[PDB]
Write an enzyme that holds these catalytic residues in place. Structure first.
Site, short mmCIF file in Angstrom:
data_model
loop_
_atom_site.label_atom_id
_atom_site.label_comp_id
_atom_site.label_asym_id
_atom_site.label_seq_id
_atom_site.Cartn_x
_atom_site.Cartn_y
_atom_site.Cartn_z
N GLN A 132 -6.09 -3.44 -7.21
CA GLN A 132 -4.65 -3.68 -7.29
C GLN A 132 -4.35 -5.16 -7.16
OE1 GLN A 132 -3.30 -1.32 -3.96
NE2 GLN A 132 -5.25 -1.85 -2.98
N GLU A 154 -2.60 -2.08 5.52
CA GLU A 154 -1.63 -3.10 5.92
C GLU A 154 -1.60 -3.35 7.43
OE1 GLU A 154 2.26 -2.26 4.47
OE2 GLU A 154 3.30 -2.96 6.30
N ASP A 204 -9.72 2.20 4.66
CA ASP A 204 -9.09 1.76 3.43
C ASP A 204 -10.17 1.40 2.43
OD1 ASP A 204 -7.42 -0.21 1.54
OD2 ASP A 204 -5.98 0.88 2.82
N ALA A 229 -11.83 7.44 1.62
CA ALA A 229 -11.59 8.26 2.81
C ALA A 229 -12.36 9.58 2.75
CB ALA A 229 -10.10 8.51 2.97
N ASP A 262 -2.14 7.86 4.67
CA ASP A 262 -1.27 6.75 4.28
C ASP A 262 -1.71 6.17 2.94
OD1 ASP A 262 0.73 4.88 4.29
OD2 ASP A 262 -0.07 3.70 5.98
#
Lengths: 291, 292, 291, 292
Positions: free
Chosen positions: D31, D86, D106, D138, D155
């Site tokens: 990303q 984050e 993550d 994950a 999340d």
């Protein structure tokens, strides 16, 4: 597609460019200053929310502004710039082998310092001995000094009604202030605002008509500047002819200007000074004279 | 101050016009068709999201597309339009008294029927007895008939590979299909994409170079179109010279065209065909040729 | 992706929706009127450049505005609407089997006629016998008549400083003009502006606090309205309790309101009237009272 | 008034924030990563063009994501975060004194290292001795270890087929991979996409329905997040009941969480878990289950 800078070009027309970053921001008592890093035009100088130059195509504007006037001079020695605090007008002048003194006269000290700090392209130009920077109103500077100039270059903001640069486009200013400060055979050139098929009626034709009422020999010319979203205009004005072939222009370029021009050769300027039918008719029949 | 038409001229560059109305939105299988009433540029024809024609300045595009080619021709009598479904190319061609037949060949009858009813500036052109409308691929039409033309006008979309219009810009097409259908002295002119100081390298220089492989005389030229937010380009090509002075172009305009041109005089064309140093140098050193 | 309507929600926040068309445009001496056909929200009524309702989710706003107040009434018979010239507030009232008279009191004649012409959803409501439309200022209308009302519904523009609807949110207006025109057991309800986590401090808390200083029983509640780009707020206020279970609300709904509600059942309103911690703290500790 | 960040919430709907600065733009292969300083919402973390976190109101999202699950648990000691790069989910979890270990898993170390340095609100969380950061898918991580957790926090990005995150919402995943790794009384909570009156039908109702196939007690709930321009949704799931009063939630908050919550009290959660009629009816009649 996420970050954009937006410019209202006209009332009903906006011009948006994607942003890499907001690089630097200053301000004077006079205006807001910003240097944006834009995706389509690179580094862009925005003054009071209006794009004034962009890294990709400023060379077009400044080559067109400067080189026609001095090439039609047989030996341009001293040159006074009204405005041009960006340094790019000085940069292009300084590549001429014939100037012994460029004075850049901008009223906004902070704009000069900003561009001297952040426009990499002009710091060789800014640290040149022939170059003198003066912070003062151009008319006040010219009236107060008595040194006459080979060439005077108008690089101000457009003469919008109610601004302070308006009076620097008046017929009384050309005839009573500017021209007395031109040497014999001198040449004046000014940027003259938008020169599109419809947009040329805002100021371009009025600046042409005004200079017609002061100098015997006046040539308007124009060229597309992509970042300005329009054709842009300039006007030359002298009391000696400004009639050179494209071939002579090419000759004088390869002899007096260091390095090769990126945009302007003789044929480009011949074409540039051949306005289109509607623009030519509008100019040749305009009445208003900025007083 | 709240309704806007937005167009991404470049993927990082947006051009936005304030809107009065949306007069029609619709579609064929080829493209979405919209007609907008904009404040800066009047009624605007948008095809597949791209402005193709604005009321205030489409005359520039159409006068530049059409007139130079015809004026250069000794006596142009019949013309073929590749594309031209909006009617404005036909309209400018029908301004010439020497013209006896115009064939408009557009692949999308939806566009033709829409503009025939909604672009009223073109109504008399659409009803001129000299116009014939053909709904076909232009290449198929030209190969399907043995008729030649004095002028062939390319008014298609910009060449992008895979589109139905790419093949109408290839060397093979120009040389094996188009040139056989030009009469002696015949002239081909096509729109040639953006021609700005940087945008000219997308298609403009390649189209110039391609035609230079096929035709003796190839004349590129360009002009600012405000609604396009760029210089737009066109290319003349012929096996007979394309070499008239501004004054000879003007005498011909007065003799052959009914009414006065709004954009184009002889001096404008000479200026348009004098490109800038970088654009000249680019087209001179261009290497690419379109092919399949 | 080509045609957009743009709304400045806040100073630094814009909300743009794609457009199918601009359907109709009128104007009064009071405001600009437009009916846009939007892609995400359908037909959208824009008054002076501000979106006031949208076809997809106006039912949320108008079900929330109207049904809580009248359900907490044992028998609401007459209802006076301040504002609500769109017809949708009247529409929702008219589905109650207990009103014998809805008066809609909007000062802008042209807005009523426009919505009566073009909002298909309310022409059954507009041509209903129980419905009387009055063109006059709401305070002037209420002071001049002496007929008391079971329910008064505030459906005005937000109380922006310097507008004319501001005085219709003042403590003196509630106590001296509005409430004397409430019958015994009457219930007032007003829209109360934005009720977001930060936006509720503009007017929502001030309208709550003001109504606290006039009625003994005041309940604020809120719900997301997508086309408004925010949680929106309403306040109920009476001198009789407004405490009904979700189950009783459901009972009273399936008995007094024709047809099934799209958005609001008892549990929805229970949840709606349970504000979040920060909004509850802000409301329970606000001082300013619109005078 | 001239620099703006634009986000297409929906393809026909745009949400634009005025900009102060662009603090960083960059990318991993997963990303693009940007950190903007916006006027309405302060510093905003944008991943692949989508705002994920705004300084003024990320507390709403993170308090709602985290607290309800932990508060419902009798004594949550170790937690696994699917995603959470984050740092703000970890930050809220580390506010609980009962917590002994947090594992943040993550897939994009670029995001983790960026937020570790630039989201200073999360600095102490990143340096807490109870946090372990794992850079892995994950699902692979949870299958690779036989350790169970009291709470697992989803999340991740919204499920779209083909994305690396879709498989973390399937029935098979919940039942064969996740549930085995929950301790007795364990609770799973995931973010569940938009939950507005119309937007809730994209993923929210399907995620609810899917979990309802796997867990005895499934509690959906939602809350407005202004920077998201929508209601956002989350779903609790457990094989032990999820049934506390607002007052019991509050007593627990005072006993277990250091400092006061800015958004969430017990009454807020009860309100959040009372959905509107149409959203309730939609989730009740929902048929779709995520699978592969």
């Amino acid at each position: 597609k996420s970050c954009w800078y937006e410019e209202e070009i006209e009332e009903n027309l906006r011009w948006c460019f994607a942003l890499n970053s907001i690089l630097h921001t200053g301000a004077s008592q006079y205006q807001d200053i910003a240097l944006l890093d834009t995706k389509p035009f690179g580094k862009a100088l925005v003054l009071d929310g209006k794009l004034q130059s962009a890294e990709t195509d400023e060379f077009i504007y400044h080559e067109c502004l400067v080189h026609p006037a001095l090439l039609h001079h047989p030996m341009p020695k001293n040159v006074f710039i009204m405005g041009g605090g960006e340094g790019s007008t000085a940069r292009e002048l300084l590549r001429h082998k014939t100037i012994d003194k460029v004075v850049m006269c901008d009223i906004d000290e902070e704009v000069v310092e900003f561009c001297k700090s952040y426009l990499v392209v002009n710091k060789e130009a800014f640290h040149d001995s022939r170059l003198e920077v003066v912070i003062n109103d151009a008319k006040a500077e010219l009236e107060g000094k008595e040194e006459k100039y080979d060439v005077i270059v108008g690089d101000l903001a457009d003469p919008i009604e109610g601004g302070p640069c308006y009076k620097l486009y008046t017929k009384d200013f050309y005839e009573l202030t500017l021209k007395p400060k031109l040497k014999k055979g001198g040449i004046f050139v000014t940027q003259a605002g938008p020169a599109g098929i419809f947009s040329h009626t805002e100021v371009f034709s009025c600046i042409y008509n005004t200079l017609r009422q002061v100098f015997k020999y006046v040539v308007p010319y124009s060229a597309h500047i992509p970042s300005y979203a329009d054709i842009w205009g300039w006007v030359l004005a002298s009391d000696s002819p400004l009639d050179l072939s494209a071939e002579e222009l090419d000759i004088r370029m390869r002899q007096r200007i260091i390095e090769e021009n990126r945009y302007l050769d003789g044929k480009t300027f011949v074409s540039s000074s051949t306005l289109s039918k509607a623009v030519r008719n509008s100019l040749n029949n305009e009445t208003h004279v900025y007083t």
